[PDB]
Amino acid sequence: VEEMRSRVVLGEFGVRNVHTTDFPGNYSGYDDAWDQDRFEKNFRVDVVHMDENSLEFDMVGIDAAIANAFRRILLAEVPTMAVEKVLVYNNTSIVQDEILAHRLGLIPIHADPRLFEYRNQGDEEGTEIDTLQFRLQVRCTRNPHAAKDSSDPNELYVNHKVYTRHMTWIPLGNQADLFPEGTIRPVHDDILIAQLRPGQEIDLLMHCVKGIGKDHAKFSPVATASYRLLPDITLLEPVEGEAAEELSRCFSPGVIEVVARVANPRLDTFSREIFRNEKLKKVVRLARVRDHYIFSVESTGVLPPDVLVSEAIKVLMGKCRRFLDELDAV
Amino acid sequence: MGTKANLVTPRNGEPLIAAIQDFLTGAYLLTLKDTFFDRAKACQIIASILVGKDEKIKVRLPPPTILKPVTLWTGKQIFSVILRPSDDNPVRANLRTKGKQYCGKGEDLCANDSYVTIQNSELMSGSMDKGTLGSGSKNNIFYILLRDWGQNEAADAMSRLARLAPVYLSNRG
Amino acid sequence: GILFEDIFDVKDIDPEGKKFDRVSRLHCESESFKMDLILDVNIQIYPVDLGDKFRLVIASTLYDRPSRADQFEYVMYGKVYRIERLSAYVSYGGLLMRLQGDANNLHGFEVDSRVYLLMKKL
Amino acid sequence: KTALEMVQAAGTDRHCVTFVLHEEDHTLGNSLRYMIMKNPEVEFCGYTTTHPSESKINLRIQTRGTLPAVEPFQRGLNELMNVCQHVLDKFEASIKDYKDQKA
Amino acid sequence: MIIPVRCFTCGKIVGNKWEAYLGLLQAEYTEGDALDALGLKRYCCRRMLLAHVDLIEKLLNYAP
Amino acid sequence: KFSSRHGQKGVCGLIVPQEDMPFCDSGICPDIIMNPHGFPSRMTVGKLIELLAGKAGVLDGRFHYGTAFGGSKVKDVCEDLVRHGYNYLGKDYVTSGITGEPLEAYIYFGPVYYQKLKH
Ligand SMILES: [Zn+2]
């Protein structure tokens, strides 16, 4: 009689409706055969809470298959620049060479991609159109005004800790297009690379390349790029008389109002505490809307997150125009 | 000494090469009476079985077992695609047996549904236990496909299930 | 083209206790033919309750272009697979039907043949 | 040499082809599967990775009538590219509206 | 050894949150809400500071 | 070979990319997907509590003692997940990485101490 192919329903032991189930000739009476202007009208994007290094826009009105492209494309197919070859000179640190050279890899780099191109051949020399070199020269001694205390900031601290402030930029070529903080070493200047004791050196050049995130996860532009369907919670029965404040502490705190009203459902983490109550579990069905999700992009800081998403859509479109031109050849 | 020849141990005659662990609990959860797939998920689970000597067959999805209110397949109808994926496949497997947690009374009509009946490689009733898919029973299908239809069809239907049943289970969780 | 039809009264929604969340096995009785049937019905799409008169039609064919028999509102598709007062076991993928009794009106049935259900409430 | 079709038989059947899309994975397959399943003339669409070692998917399209197993595929991308054109513009019009509301 | 500069699961930049974390534990701050002050929401990035041991200040002693 | 601090050792059979892996709601994709068939024959229920005592442990900033014959019981660990908005058994609702639809059943989820060993 009534069709919730539009809500997944979360039981106590399983998640019930799950698969999309809306294609031609599945639900009789319903014509769902990809009307383009119907999708064009029922779709909007509602942005909530975009500061630096976060984004929580919505994208209401697409299936969870194309939404799992934009999560996946953000995660491992939007390119970034990261350190790939660490040309090492004298390095007398106690940190091992590869583990240093691996820890230089995970540092993000504020120079945005799509100014540069990929590295074509092996090409370990770089061509200043592909790469971006960095220098790291730290040699720590004792400071002369050190007191007798064993405080490592006070004594032994010329450069006891190799932060990413010590990395600098060797402009490879013209490199006048980018400005002074233009290639701000590691997006974060507080990252601890290694620790030293006096008489120890770290001297190394670096090479940065433009890499897909699926090649290696140090190229990943985003911390987490997950998404989640917007929940909607329907009290089938009116709840009042101290069972409302019982249902208040049952859910997430901000979600509810006190009679009982489901004030704001978007803030609900799925603890599923109702089924512990043994009385209200028959009262309210909890559900999540299928075509209304909540994206949550938090960039590492290479590109601002409103330009990560608009790049993520831009390379999915490029992935299908790459194939549509294959059929034009054939 | 090929695996397609030594499917059967020489102590009993039982088959030793048959599903283990997840494939059994994959295909039990798929052929369980409650599952229903729409043509979304049905063509997705089925089209997992199309690589590696299987990519050149016109895979025939069977007509769905619910038509009018919503149309959707059942789980056992997709397990029949393992035994006979194409149209021109000559396999007609037949098997009727008891199962684990057997209902005791009732031949095949009781609600516990632990009674397998395959007619012409179409799972008609019952759910696939270990005793109808695993190793040690002389009435699992891979033993029945061995004796009646050669040993190439038993190794294909066993290498179909190993490809199909994790693809269902990793999306059913 | 109809093989068999009558009005039925569902008497036990699930006889031995709910075993599945989407399928419950009905026990019904006919009107003046006295054909017992034990039918499984997907109840999530088509909920049924105790003591509910519902039509039931078994057809070999349904005759969107040929304009199907769609006055009914619950249509399955499966094959007969056993004939044992005859029982007549029909399987609908996994959903069993054990229409029974009085073999003169059951005459249209055979074994290994495709069979539609066309149910409807009343 | 990315996309390549697989003939069903030596005689050749256009009602069912098997597209092998190189160097890709579910990121496209599961989003193109959906946009080509919403076609009313496809009775079977589905994809599988051959192996996690190599990188390719095997999309298989089977139509109803005489669909050349290429015309839904060339319309699966064209509907998806029109989506990614639209969802981008609705995204950039909304960030530009959110930033201005914060000022 | 030393603090791994990423989370292993998500990859939040967490290597720059060690001496900022140790500066918090030097004060009154409890082990719990110290990581809520550094912006560590999920637990997988929270275990990279909580379950981490710092051998590198101890190895340095035996490395003249 | 990895072991799992309960004698359930295991060769690392497959290394999937991160984007093919069942992320939960808050974003946490797993590191080591463990098969659940190691449990009902081995009956290592002590592993199933480490995914609970660990997951409540990191969320509170606390190291839960599970010693022999004592330690932190389940009836007080489970009511610590509820304060941080988690399921009181630890089974968290995930959505699948490959297909994008949510998984049909909830997935147990948490940090347990995996020690690599010298094979
Ligand atoms: Zn993380």
PDB file of C-alpha atoms in Angstrom, chain C residues 1-119:
ATOM      1  CA  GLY C   1      -6.508 -19.243 -19.743  1.00  0.00           C
ATOM      2  CA  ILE C   2      -7.152 -19.612 -16.005  1.00  0.00           C
ATOM      3  CA  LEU C   3      -6.021 -22.861 -14.457  1.00  0.00           C
ATOM      4  CA  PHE C   4      -7.762 -22.490 -11.107  1.00  0.00           C
ATOM      5  CA  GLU C   5      -9.522 -19.843  -9.040  1.00  0.00           C
ATOM      6  CA  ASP C   6     -11.736 -19.333  -5.979  1.00  0.00           C
ATOM      7  CA  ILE C   7     -12.222 -17.134  -2.928  1.00  0.00           C
ATOM      8  CA  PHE C   8     -10.145 -18.064   0.108  1.00  0.00           C
ATOM      9  CA  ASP C   9     -10.225 -17.320   3.839  1.00  0.00           C
ATOM     10  CA  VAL C  10      -6.850 -17.115   5.519  1.00  0.00           C
ATOM     11  CA  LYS C  11      -7.128 -18.816   8.904  1.00  0.00           C
ATOM     12  CA  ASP C  12      -3.624 -19.092  10.412  1.00  0.00           C
ATOM     13  CA  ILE C  13      -1.396 -16.131   9.480  1.00  0.00           C
ATOM     14  CA  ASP C  14       1.634 -18.167  10.500  1.00  0.00           C
ATOM     15  CA  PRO C  15       0.930 -21.608  11.961  1.00  0.00           C
ATOM     16  CA  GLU C  16       4.140 -22.593  13.805  1.00  0.00           C
ATOM     17  CA  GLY C  17       5.439 -19.112  14.783  1.00  0.00           C
ATOM     18  CA  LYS C  18       7.049 -16.242  12.854  1.00  0.00           C
ATOM     19  CA  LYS C  19      10.274 -17.540  11.353  1.00  0.00           C
ATOM     20  CA  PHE C  20      10.987 -14.797   8.815  1.00  0.00           C
ATOM     21  CA  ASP C  21      10.640 -11.039   8.812  1.00  0.00           C
ATOM     22  CA  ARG C  22       9.336 -10.656   5.270  1.00  0.00           C
ATOM     23  CA  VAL C  23       7.469 -13.901   4.533  1.00  0.00           C
ATOM     24  CA  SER C  24       4.711 -15.515   6.558  1.00  0.00           C
ATOM     25  CA  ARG C  25       3.109 -18.803   5.586  1.00  0.00           C
ATOM     26  CA  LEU C  26      -0.660 -18.623   5.366  1.00  0.00           C
ATOM     27  CA  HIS C  27      -3.156 -21.419   5.900  1.00  0.00           C
ATOM     28  CA  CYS C  28      -6.385 -20.917   4.008  1.00  0.00           C
ATOM     29  CA  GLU C  29      -9.654 -22.649   3.087  1.00  0.00           C
ATOM     30  CA  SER C  30     -11.699 -22.257  -0.059  1.00  0.00           C
ATOM     31  CA  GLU C  31     -15.349 -21.371  -0.624  1.00  0.00           C
ATOM     32  CA  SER C  32     -17.456 -24.488  -1.441  1.00  0.00           C
ATOM     33  CA  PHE C  33     -14.552 -26.242  -3.185  1.00  0.00           C
ATOM     34  CA  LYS C  34     -12.653 -26.879   0.067  1.00  0.00           C
ATOM     35  CA  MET C  35      -9.177 -26.551  -1.394  1.00  0.00           C
ATOM     36  CA  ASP C  36      -6.741 -26.163   1.448  1.00  0.00           C
ATOM     37  CA  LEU C  37      -3.690 -24.148   0.484  1.00  0.00           C
ATOM     38  CA  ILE C  38      -0.509 -23.337   2.371  1.00  0.00           C
ATOM     39  CA  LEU C  39       0.803 -20.205   0.701  1.00  0.00           C
ATOM     40  CA  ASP C  40       3.805 -18.046   1.559  1.00  0.00           C
ATOM     41  CA  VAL C  41       3.265 -14.344   0.893  1.00  0.00           C
ATOM     42  CA  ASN C  42       5.731 -11.477   0.997  1.00  0.00           C
ATOM     43  CA  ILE C  43       3.961  -9.396   3.612  1.00  0.00           C
ATOM     44  CA  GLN C  44       6.186  -6.352   3.437  1.00  0.00           C
ATOM     45  CA  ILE C  45       4.749  -5.525   0.042  1.00  0.00           C
ATOM     46  CA  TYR C  46       1.332  -7.067   0.621  1.00  0.00           C
ATOM     47  CA  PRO C  47       0.326  -7.323   4.273  1.00  0.00           C
ATOM     48  CA  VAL C  48      -2.296  -9.914   5.152  1.00  0.00           C
ATOM     49  CA  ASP C  49      -4.217 -10.345   8.388  1.00  0.00           C
ATOM     50  CA  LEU C  50      -6.240 -13.001  10.165  1.00  0.00           C
ATOM     51  CA  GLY C  51      -9.636 -13.833   8.725  1.00  0.00           C
ATOM     52  CA  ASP C  52      -9.298 -11.909   5.462  1.00  0.00           C
ATOM     53  CA  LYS C  53     -11.240 -13.050   2.410  1.00  0.00           C
ATOM     54  CA  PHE C  54      -9.010 -12.768  -0.609  1.00  0.00           C
ATOM     55  CA  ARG C  55      -9.322 -13.928  -4.179  1.00  0.00           C
ATOM     56  CA  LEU C  56      -6.769 -16.254  -5.687  1.00  0.00           C
ATOM     57  CA  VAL C  57      -6.286 -17.069  -9.361  1.00  0.00           C
ATOM     58  CA  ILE C  58      -3.791 -19.477 -10.892  1.00  0.00           C
ATOM     59  CA  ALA C  59      -3.120 -18.686 -14.535  1.00  0.00           C
ATOM     60  CA  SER C  60      -0.706 -20.073 -17.074  1.00  0.00           C
ATOM     61  CA  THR C  61      -0.555 -16.702 -18.815  1.00  0.00           C
ATOM     62  CA  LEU C  62      -1.527 -13.127 -18.130  1.00  0.00           C
ATOM     63  CA  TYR C  63      -3.376 -12.400 -21.376  1.00  0.00           C
ATOM     64  CA  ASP C  64       2.834  -3.371 -20.698  1.00  0.00           C
ATOM     65  CA  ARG C  65       2.011  -3.668 -24.389  1.00  0.00           C
ATOM     66  CA  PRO C  66      -0.225  -6.807 -24.338  1.00  0.00           C
ATOM     67  CA  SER C  67      -2.171  -5.211 -21.397  1.00  0.00           C
ATOM     68  CA  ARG C  68      -1.680  -7.938 -18.772  1.00  0.00           C
ATOM     69  CA  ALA C  69      -4.184  -9.343 -16.303  1.00  0.00           C
ATOM     70  CA  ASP C  70      -3.620  -6.614 -13.732  1.00  0.00           C
ATOM     71  CA  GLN C  71      -6.986  -6.212 -11.999  1.00  0.00           C
ATOM     72  CA  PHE C  72      -5.434  -8.324  -9.260  1.00  0.00           C
ATOM     73  CA  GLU C  73      -2.915  -6.697  -6.972  1.00  0.00           C
ATOM     74  CA  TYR C  74      -0.366  -9.355  -6.045  1.00  0.00           C
ATOM     75  CA  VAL C  75       1.235 -11.419  -8.780  1.00  0.00           C
ATOM     76  CA  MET C  76       3.914 -14.042  -8.343  1.00  0.00           C
ATOM     77  CA  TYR C  77       5.486 -16.380 -10.868  1.00  0.00           C
ATOM     78  CA  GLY C  78       6.687 -19.903 -10.334  1.00  0.00           C
ATOM     79  CA  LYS C  79       6.510 -23.476 -11.424  1.00  0.00           C
ATOM     80  CA  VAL C  80       4.660 -26.525 -10.192  1.00  0.00           C
ATOM     81  CA  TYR C  81       7.114 -29.100  -9.048  1.00  0.00           C
ATOM     82  CA  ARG C  82       5.251 -31.933  -7.323  1.00  0.00           C
ATOM     83  CA  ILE C  83       1.840 -33.592  -7.491  1.00  0.00           C
ATOM     84  CA  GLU C  84       1.432 -36.053  -4.641  1.00  0.00           C
ATOM     85  CA  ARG C  85      -7.632 -35.451  -3.215  1.00  0.00           C
ATOM     86  CA  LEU C  86      -4.372 -34.397  -4.869  1.00  0.00           C
ATOM     87  CA  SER C  87      -1.836 -32.039  -3.453  1.00  0.00           C
ATOM     88  CA  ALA C  88      -0.272 -29.694  -5.973  1.00  0.00           C
ATOM     89  CA  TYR C  89       3.002 -28.203  -4.817  1.00  0.00           C
ATOM     90  CA  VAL C  90       3.945 -24.933  -6.482  1.00  0.00           C
ATOM     91  CA  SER C  91       7.214 -23.163  -5.834  1.00  0.00           C
ATOM     92  CA  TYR C  92       7.698 -19.444  -6.358  1.00  0.00           C
ATOM     93  CA  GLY C  93      11.433 -19.263  -6.064  1.00  0.00           C
ATOM     94  CA  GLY C  94      11.333 -20.119  -2.417  1.00  0.00           C
ATOM     95  CA  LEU C  95       7.734 -19.393  -1.626  1.00  0.00           C
ATOM     96  CA  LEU C  96       5.798 -22.635  -1.481  1.00  0.00           C
ATOM     97  CA  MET C  97       2.144 -23.282  -2.254  1.00  0.00           C
ATOM     98  CA  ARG C  98       0.487 -26.595  -1.418  1.00  0.00           C
ATOM     99  CA  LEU C  99      -2.951 -26.271  -2.973  1.00  0.00           C
ATOM    100  CA  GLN C 100      -4.765 -29.484  -2.109  1.00  0.00           C
ATOM    101  CA  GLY C 101      -7.923 -31.494  -2.432  1.00  0.00           C
ATOM    102  CA  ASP C 102     -10.624 -32.722  -4.810  1.00  0.00           C
ATOM    103  CA  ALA C 103      -8.694 -33.618  -7.965  1.00  0.00           C
ATOM    104  CA  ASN C 104     -11.524 -32.982 -10.438  1.00  0.00           C
ATOM    105  CA  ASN C 105     -11.143 -29.200 -10.317  1.00  0.00           C
ATOM    106  CA  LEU C 106      -7.357 -29.455 -10.041  1.00  0.00           C
ATOM    107  CA  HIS C 107      -7.308 -30.962 -13.554  1.00  0.00           C
ATOM    108  CA  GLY C 108      -5.544 -28.084 -15.262  1.00  0.00           C
ATOM    109  CA  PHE C 109      -2.316 -28.682 -13.362  1.00  0.00           C
ATOM    110  CA  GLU C 110       0.716 -30.631 -14.502  1.00  0.00           C
ATOM    111  CA  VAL C 111       4.376 -30.898 -13.475  1.00  0.00           C
ATOM    112  CA  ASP C 112       7.158 -28.630 -14.806  1.00  0.00           C
ATOM    113  CA  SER C 113       5.006 -25.784 -16.021  1.00  0.00           C
ATOM    114  CA  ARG C 114       5.036 -22.060 -15.355  1.00  0.00           C
ATOM    115  CA  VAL C 115       2.260 -20.735 -13.157  1.00  0.00           C
ATOM    116  CA  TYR C 116       1.223 -17.257 -12.072  1.00  0.00           C
ATOM    117  CA  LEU C 117      -0.575 -16.229  -8.915  1.00  0.00           C
ATOM    118  CA  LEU C 118      -2.983 -13.307  -9.067  1.00  0.00           C
ATOM    119  CA  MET C 119      -4.255 -12.456  -5.584  1.00  0.00           C
TER     120      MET C 119
END
